[PDB]
Write a protein that binds this ligand. Structure first.
Ligand SMILES: CC[C@H](C)[C@H](N)C(=O)O
Ligand SMILES: CC[C@H](C)[C@H](N)C(=O)O
Ligand SMILES: [Zn+2]
Ligand SMILES: [Zn+2]
Lengths: 121, 115
């Protein structure tokens, strides 16, 4: 845990321009950023990118996005989100991170946070 | 389309308690509700359930939930969500925001149930 997403607020809905706030801590420094996007997660990634650029960190390209719930999980089901990344470019640098949470967007933020640390660590 | 979801606002994140607002039109009546949940969509359905309960409508149980983006993945990718219900059928939603894609499928399920 060298990079932590202290908090984030994600907005979306019908009649709403999606947006997200982020507050991440890295090396005794806290970065707060906001951005709109075509979707909540997209907005979250756009805000994240302004931070990583500042830090000189390159974010891998999102190659695959998978979401699943256990059978008969229902509305409050735990969501498993698997995101596949690629640093370049073709297969040799492809990897996946995963997140599990009752909110599907948080699950994605968690998988993204894991990715960030794997790249930094 | 018999039932229309005029608007809805969903809010989640780390450090926030998931909540959602919904505004729907049915049989010449406007219904507006709010509620928290374990997740945005969960909050949305909790708010929807208050409405359906008032209408005497029982919502089908959510059995499976599928989310996919087209090949050549990108953060701003369109989301295609397929939800499976059982009292067993399926509804679909397509939208750049994945929570909205689910809501669209939920709206479809609703209209299909209120026939
Ligand atoms: C990977 C696609 C993402 C999840 C979608 N565009 C959203 O912001 O909801
Ligand atoms: C079907 C499970 C839903 C998507 C999840 N509990 C959420 O509200 O994010
Ligand atoms: Zn907001
Ligand atoms: Zn709010």
């Amino acid at each position: 845990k060298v990079l932590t997403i202290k908090s984030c607020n994600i907005h979306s809905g019908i009649g709403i321009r999606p947006h997200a706030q982020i507050e991440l801590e890295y090396q005794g420094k806290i970065h707060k950023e906001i951005s709109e996007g075509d979707g909540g997660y997209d907005a979250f990634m756009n805000a994240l990118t302004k931070i990583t650029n500042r830090l000189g960190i390159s974010i891998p390209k999102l190659i695959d996005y998978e979401v699943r719930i256990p059978p008969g999980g229902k509305t409050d089901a735990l969501v498993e989100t698997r995101i596949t990344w690629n640093k370049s470019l073709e297969e040799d640098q492809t990897f996946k991170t995963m997140g599990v949470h009752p909110d599907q967007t948080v699950a994605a933020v968690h998988a993204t946070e894991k990715m960030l640390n794997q790249i930094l660590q």
